[PDB]
Design a protein around this ligand. Sequence first.
Ligand code: ZN
Ligand code: ZN
Ligand code: ZN
Ligand code: ZN
Ligand code: ZN
Length: 1752
Amino acid sequence: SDDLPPISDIEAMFDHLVSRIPDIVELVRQLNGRKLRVATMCSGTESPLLALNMIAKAIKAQHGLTLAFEHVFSCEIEPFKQAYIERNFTPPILFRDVTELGKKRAHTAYGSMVDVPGDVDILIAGTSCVDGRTFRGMLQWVKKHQPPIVILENVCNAPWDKVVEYFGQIDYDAQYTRLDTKEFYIPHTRTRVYLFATPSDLPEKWAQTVKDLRRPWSSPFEAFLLHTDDPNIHRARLELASARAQTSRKTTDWNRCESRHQRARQDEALGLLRPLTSWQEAGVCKGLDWTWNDWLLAQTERVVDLLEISTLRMAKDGIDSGFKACIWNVSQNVDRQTGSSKTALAPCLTPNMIPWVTIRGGPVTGREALALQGIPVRELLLTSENEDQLADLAGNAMTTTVVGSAMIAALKVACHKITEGANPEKEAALILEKEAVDDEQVANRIIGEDYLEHHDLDLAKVTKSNLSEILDLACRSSRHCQCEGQSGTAPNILECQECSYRACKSCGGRPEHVYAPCANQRVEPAEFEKRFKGLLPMRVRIAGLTDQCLNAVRKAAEKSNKGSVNDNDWQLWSTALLEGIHDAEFRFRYLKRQSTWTAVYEARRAMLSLVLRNQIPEWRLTIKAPASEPNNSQLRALLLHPVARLQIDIAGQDVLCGPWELCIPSMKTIDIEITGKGELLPSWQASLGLQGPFANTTRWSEVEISLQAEDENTLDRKLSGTYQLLPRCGQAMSSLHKKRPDDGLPQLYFFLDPTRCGESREDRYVFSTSTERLDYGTERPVIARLDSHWREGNEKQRKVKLDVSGAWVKCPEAHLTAIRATFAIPSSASAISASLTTEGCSHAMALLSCRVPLDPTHSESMWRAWAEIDLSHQGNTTFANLAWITERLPPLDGLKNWAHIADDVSEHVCERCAPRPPKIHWIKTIIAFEDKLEAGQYEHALKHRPSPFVVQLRLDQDIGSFRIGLNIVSLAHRALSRLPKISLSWRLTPGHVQPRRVFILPSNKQDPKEQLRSLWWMLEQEKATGKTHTFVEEEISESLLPAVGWRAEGKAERPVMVRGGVIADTVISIALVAQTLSDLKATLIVVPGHLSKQWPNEIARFTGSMFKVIVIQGMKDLQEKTIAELGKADIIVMASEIFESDVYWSRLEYLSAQPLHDRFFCDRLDAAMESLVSQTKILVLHMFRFRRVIADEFTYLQKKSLAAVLRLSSSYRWILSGTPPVSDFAAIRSIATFMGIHLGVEDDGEGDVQYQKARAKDQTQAEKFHAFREVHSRAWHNRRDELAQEFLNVFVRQNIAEIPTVEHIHTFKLPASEGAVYLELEHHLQALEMQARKETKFKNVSQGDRNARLEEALSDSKTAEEALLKRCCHFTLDLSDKTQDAKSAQEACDHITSARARQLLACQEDLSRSVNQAIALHGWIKKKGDDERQPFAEWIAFSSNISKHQGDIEAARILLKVIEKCGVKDGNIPPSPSDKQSPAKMDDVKWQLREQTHLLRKLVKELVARVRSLRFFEVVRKIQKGKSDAQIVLESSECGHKPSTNPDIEMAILSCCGHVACHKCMRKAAASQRCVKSGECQAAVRPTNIVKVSSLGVEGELSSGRYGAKLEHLVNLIHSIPKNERVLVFLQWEDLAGKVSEALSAGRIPHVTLAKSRANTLDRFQSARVLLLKMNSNLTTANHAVFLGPLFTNSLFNYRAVETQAIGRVRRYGQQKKVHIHRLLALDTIDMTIFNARRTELKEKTDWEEIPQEEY
DNA sequence: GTCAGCGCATGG
DNA sequence: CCATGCGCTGACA
Ligand SMILES: [Zn+2]
Ligand SMILES: [Zn+2]
Ligand SMILES: [Zn+2]
Ligand SMILES: [Zn+2]
Ligand SMILES: [Zn+2]
């Protein structure tokens, strides 16, 4: 309820629970100090563990008695759940599965197979223990050992009774009840079912006590949600925008549920428009400017529209969702929603949820979902878990307070059944020995501190530069658009003009102000944080208030006309104030930007914050209410708002220097009078369009407030004046007003202020000078609230009560004052290096020792001797309580460059800093395991690993001191263990807080024609003159401290020397190998087989009989060749298919004497590679090495021969390739792996999710577990990519054109009729829902014919944009068929009109036939046999009424005509005209009728779309005709602004409908989502739909003869260029190849079109001028590579490859003229869309060399 | 095989 | 009659 104290901390929940039950104090002694033994299963979140732990702490604080518990083991099945449990809640044993627990041994998560420990006190299973194979396993285990208590839980609707009879087998009692989490302290509504089962009326007693321990919720859910600014929420919001940029719009059909949405929007009598998201068919959705729009774009049309329906259903009441925090779970249907019965609650967050937090405008992130389960998220470790995975983990989790209640009542009622160890003396001796050895070890743990500078002392010092300048910097540093979030910047800010509010261009379109760009030269928020922290004092104290001074103030306010105080209120308020201020120090916590920086100071009972408003900033003081103070107490009411405000002296330089002010609880109510003036406007409900009583009501546009002279004198700031409202500016209920002009004082607004959790009536109109959006736990300045029963209205004037309370009274007596505090850093880098020694892995070495004095009075218990800070569980909350000293410390930039020993051991494993990962086997399919012994040793030496950072705190004799300890040796040893003369390093970086990097290649240019020069970098690199180390390897083993802002690496690098390289343009390699010779000596080359023939020809042509050639090909050439025939021959060839042939592996197995049968292959192969080389060292090409190796098509290899190419050995190693797969780090590592360098190690986080899942069919289960357990950070990945880039600059060379090129882009507007036909086809394919035909074959041909008829509109090809490209290239309704041929323009359009008419008719008869079949069904049911509803009859009743229709009323009339052709009048006739047979059970027949009804509805919608498209086409043709018949339709406009008026401005026609109206008067209708005559059509209009008449053109603007405009312009181009130059034309569509061949034939020039005679046609081309060919042996005589529009493909990469290949056909070589490349483009057309999108994407994502452009 | 449509059931 | 359940199955790749 609310009468309870408000409780929001889990530990306090448990303290208030244990207080209820005083019978665990008696439990501890039957236990007699023995450790409890708890063994849970299948709970992924360990709420048994957490609840029992907090019970231990609560009981210790309540009664001084200590409870223990030895968590015996736990079971979890999926990998990420196992990783989470073993990373947060470390158990002894974590088993993979649950069935094996019957056995004596079972596998563990690491694979060790350690036995099942057996007897336990208590078992808590849930969330998978009823499946039943798993339940059989759990019963088997509970039969094997005897637990005296078992507690289960699962989803409620399940067979719990069946569970009872099953537990009857093992002779166990049983009892089950359902438990409501909303009733155990938590504001979240959920129901689950528990049972208790014990060996042989006890479970009855258990049920009674658990029913007893009930305590309702009393804190709104919003106290559990993290803020919307928070860094974790903002990274979760940037994930969405990043994914959207990395990633067309496939439309799921949802008709059966759209039926329910329509029934709801009609039955609830709410309007049919969509306010929050304005989604659209084949159109994006633009939510408000604060609403996570990249999450609104991803979700489906059903979810989005269901948000729409929920928002309207709430706006009926008066609540305005978007200002009242509530949660909606929109996964379920639309009729079965009670999204939050009480708005302060939260619905059951089911595992497959889609939640929407009403306020922040986005989903409950996974972490907040975990919080509402009771788990604390302050210290939670989460390592790359997806959102869906987190929602599963949280939803199936079980609620800590509920488990605690059930489990403590269980453990009390079943007290007597647990036996006792009963040796408390030995228990005390053991635990005390443990504590003593722990303390000795922790005192020893840090070493060093002898080399430490100990130099500075500082605290409470400032800089006090200039407060005016600081305020100017704040105004430009603060947050601007909601998408910033405490960092980053968003360019193109827009600032409103009245009520200056800001948003970027991207966001911030939707509630339109009068925007205009802002002149705010941005400044980096980190820099302002530096100055602000350097100006604040870090500890302050309020001083100078006594009871007598407070009394003096109260009588001063009484002396003036400021409202007096009731004496009891004065007593409570003054006592709380004085006790809070009295000797309590303020310390700095955090400063946060929310469009105005707030600096927050917290003391132990009062809390005070600095706000840097752009005008009159101040400090405000609010006092925390007492801990146990009921929610409806007058004291808690009084201590809500701040009581003390300290304005700041602007001209002065110091920050804490102003006068104080106090507010006494006056509570004065005066009367105002609100009037009406101005015109009338549509109310908010009517702007949402609700058709209840809220339809066409109105709202006044100017109020005026008058107040008496005495009241205005009493008020601090005057309140009269006339407030116009600002309907386009958005606030509470779109009710923001602005005061007409005192000039210095800030502008104040009269609007509505709703409380975040109250009812719909407690929201009262306010006055304020502050209108921003604010968090939970912050309150706005308020001048005077108004009565809550006043809203905007149409009435004239009322006298409503204005209640101004708490007049601000100024006191002089108060004042705010500030306050060997030394900190130590290591002076010298490399002093550490000298100080450190090997085998000193044990002891960290100090980095900082600070000492700042404290007091022993009321100081924390996080101080103590020393103490483990236990950072992995409490460091995040520790280094928050040390801001007041850490914020002063200089960042210690001295140690920022690596330095350490060298010539370290070339191979080592510490096996305490980095134990050896186990070894992998195979079964035979392939299934891999882990060694029992090796895996057990791995688990042991992994659980016992050293601490990378140590932080400890000490307080001995009221002086505070803490030391920071870092291990160097441990990072170094991890660095070495990563690697396969190794000189180590280490460095530390202070203060560290993105698109995939492009990978460029260094050209072979400006080096000692190109055939000669590119050899220079070849030979000298082959020799490697000098070059002791050509490449220096690396590894980095780095751990970081989150809060303080440090990340310390450790680098182990192996220098290596290697020869070779990679070149990307066979003609120079062969020109090289002859010299290098001037197995023993033999050079190998591997070619796929397509291209092996060219090398013997080329070597014969270049070198004449210089040597021997041993070219081979295919399998049966190894057996002929012997050693002395193969040898002493300079050039050898090979074919990559041979390494794929099984003969090669047969021979290799035989010669290697291995028992192999083609990752698995790459394992067994290298076993044989070790074997062969020993037999060859005694006295298949991979049994022997070479001097050189050259590969030609590295990209082509298919991992099966690629393995062999890696394995083969040689003295030198080269590559030839057209281009390598250098775009990605995995491929870069593959190239380097061939070259022989361990460039990096694979950590399975760097590849995208596609490639990760490509590999993750290989990984062992334990390896998936480890990959989720241990993750490495973004900076690590970036460093490794930088390393790969340096590798590229070293070794890979690339040869590129320049033979100049110049590109001429010819652009033109399409002539009128041709543009008109393109327009119609595009908007038709938009009106219908098909972007592409579907390839699946439907179950029923009665659906097949229908879907074919729908697909008819795509007569050309598959995707819609493809048909659009064909329309651009040449106008014709259908290319494929030659039945009708477009002789000219204005005739193809006639073909369109006829075909559209035919299709529309065919639609009508399909509708009639379906109606007849349905009527036959209805007759069958009626003949063969109250309350229940039969949807077809209501469909008929709805249809036969013309007045209630959505969609064009013309289509509605046509529907009436079709029904009356079927003869039904008002809904009643048994037979159908031309009746068919209606196919045994009556229920199945009813269901058939139902499905038929849905089919009719779908057909109706399709009819509506068809008639609208037809309307649009006839109208646009009318306009383009240009006659008086044309201008008549202009004269008939639903606007009323006719053209035949003295002003003749502009007209425009929509596209969704067809109507036409005043353009200026069209924009309003568009921006409110209403068609110009919405009584006529229900259009779903958006501002992109408007089309101005001047864009279309008029008939006969641009002449067209018999051909498409693009074809004509191509003809003109070829005629224009000179006659000697030859042409090459690229097409994309073969249909278009035919049409353009026709066009060029109709021209004057000849042409040549290009299976095996294609090369002959190329020979012919060497004749005719132009050879046109499809886009996607070298001809270069032609030098004009004309294009026809842009390529489109499914990927930017592939677009780049095809376009550069198409160019490289003609730009290749042998040009004595400058190659032109053209692109014909049509303005405002999808060719422009595709081309510009591809250019803009391609420039950033690849940065290739931009082709120069000129006019021609 | 991954995933969003699509639907009455059930104690208290 | 309220208030709260929380997944199986038939498209699509
Ligand atoms: Zn505004
Ligand atoms: Zn923005
Ligand atoms: Zn070590
Ligand atoms: Zn319309
Ligand atoms: Zn108009």
